[PDB]
Ligand binder design. Sequence first.
Ligand SMILES: [Zn+2]
Ligand SMILES: [Zn+2]
Ligand SMILES: [Zn+2]
Ligand SMILES: [Zn+2]
Lengths: 322, 322
Amino acid sequence: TAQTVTGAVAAAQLGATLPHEHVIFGYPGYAGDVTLGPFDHAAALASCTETARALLARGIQTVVDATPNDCGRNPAFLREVSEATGLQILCATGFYYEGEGATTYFKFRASLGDAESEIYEMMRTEVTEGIAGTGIRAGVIKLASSRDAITPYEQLFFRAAARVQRETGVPIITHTQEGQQGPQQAELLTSLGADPARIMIGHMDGNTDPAYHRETLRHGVSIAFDRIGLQGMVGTPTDAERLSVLTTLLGEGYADRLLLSHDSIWHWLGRPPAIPEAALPAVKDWHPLHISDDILPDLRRRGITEEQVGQMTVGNPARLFG
Amino acid sequence: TAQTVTGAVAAAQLGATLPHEHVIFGYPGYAGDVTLGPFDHAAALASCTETARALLARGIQTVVDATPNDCGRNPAFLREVSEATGLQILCATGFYYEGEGATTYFKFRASLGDAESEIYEMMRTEVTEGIAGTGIRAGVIKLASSRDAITPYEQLFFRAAARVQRETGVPIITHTQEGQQGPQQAELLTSLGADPARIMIGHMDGNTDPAYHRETLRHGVSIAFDRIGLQGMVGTPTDAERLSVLTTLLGEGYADRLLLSHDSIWHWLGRPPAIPEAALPAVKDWHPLHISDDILPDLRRRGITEEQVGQMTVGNPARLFG
Ligand SMILES: [Zn+2]
Ligand SMILES: [Zn+2]
Ligand SMILES: [Zn+2]
Ligand SMILES: [Zn+2]
């Protein structure tokens, strides 16, 4: 049973799923720019429902919204987008990595007490009871680490998460910064007793060395090439490079542990970002319709079977989030 | 004319003022802990109005709320507390220092464009038009720097502020981290054309070397001993030490450029902080009634005249914020 923003749905009902996307997203601090960067709800609702309908048209029935608690997460809004289109959306519980999250609060709590237990309580409540007194439960726990290490701050969340996972069985999806720490996250979470069949190490497409992936897959966890379409930003590689590594892994029988997504942001919070035309190519295909329209057909063209595509897009998510 | 959350008030109406306090405050990230750390509005309103009334009983008619945009600032709430008690409250516009603020957003904007102009637009609008479409205007601009330097991130705000100051005349109050950068802030703001008679370098009581203060006062700016009562936390000195430096400066005729406050937080956002009894003495007198009840009477006992006390508590704020 997967927990979505509109209630629990049987794993069989999940269908084709995009395991890591962002309906709305805001970098910490966006709320302080509310005067000139307010949230136009009607505009957002219209834009997001349109994208939701575009996904449903492509066979995608479920989206896992990976937005951390400190990056604009809004379950009520997600629920609104879901009830208006029929698109199933799971939301998360967790904080972003130390490098970009709103870290002051829990760094403070950690100095005056047991932040881990507090973080554990938050996650447990949001997963089993609800978020902000809305009854909307998180369907996944979101974890994130920095590029050079899983910082002590971040480890507070990893430890709390592993515990909620053991006692709830809820799935865990993560963020790896600039193609590193995938093996470490997997090692850390599994050593803490977390179920490797309910863990998805994200942004693994950020590294182009298959050895890095296999070394992460060794832990039994699933890995996600979830920034397909984002070619150039934040150090990411090109899709050509992503598919090269992905086909190699598929050729080594890893289909059952590979997932695909875009890490797209349907509607930004704060003032709309100014995209310099020099970065236009890098974000050209960075939208939720890219995998369906270009990627899957391309994989088939290069030899990937329909069974493997079904495995990555339906089989894997049904098991990981169902 | 001073701009408060309930409208403009003549400088003569300001009266005894606490130039740096926090009705509500939350460390960035507190919003992500909304499930277990929600804002109990009625409780907050009751507690804050009670403190407001306690201040009015002591002759204090005005409070300058220094809460940055990214630390829980809520003008509507402040307005509510003001209309319910008659206590005049000015609110601010600005972001916290890089060390503890929600810096991700504007650091991002600064990489894709001219963050300074954007920060300038925000401040200008909030000071001259209103905040979040409420009509409530900021009566002061809040600036903050780190301990080892005024970082490039922070300088974006200093530059934008100096510009709004020149064209609006609005006052500027600041945050200095761990007793440093006072001279630099004053130097920087004055070199940018900002009116030194409308600048108040805060947390100057964080340094116990009078040379440091005089060296800051050289710029014609006013300085605030605004953490009176906080003895031990975040590196702060004891009040005995604060008053030693303060009496020395008063003995050197600086009364017209010295202000007093507590940097208190009436109601915390997020889960109530857990105060280890070991820190009980350090925060014992860290509340808004400390200066009125213990400090001013003590100054008088040690030779400070009533004229000087009136200068610091009424004369100075009328000029700086009026
Ligand atoms: Zn991520
Ligand atoms: Zn993401
Ligand atoms: Zn401060
Ligand atoms: Zn303060």
